Amino acid sequence: AIVALVVAIIIAIVVWSIV
């Protein structure tokens, strides 16, 4: 769901961003 995406999307983006 929208929440799931945000969680993962935010997790990935945030993570991927980190390194």
Q: How many CA atoms lie within 13 A of 12 on its CB side?
A: 6
Helix/strand/coil (H, E, C) string of 1-19? CHHHHHHHHHHHHHHHHHC
The whole-angstrom separation of Cα 13 and Cα 4 is 14
Spatial distance between the Cα atoms of 4 and 10, rounded to a whole number of angstroms: 10
Cα–Cα distance for residue pair 19/12, rounded to 1 Å: 10
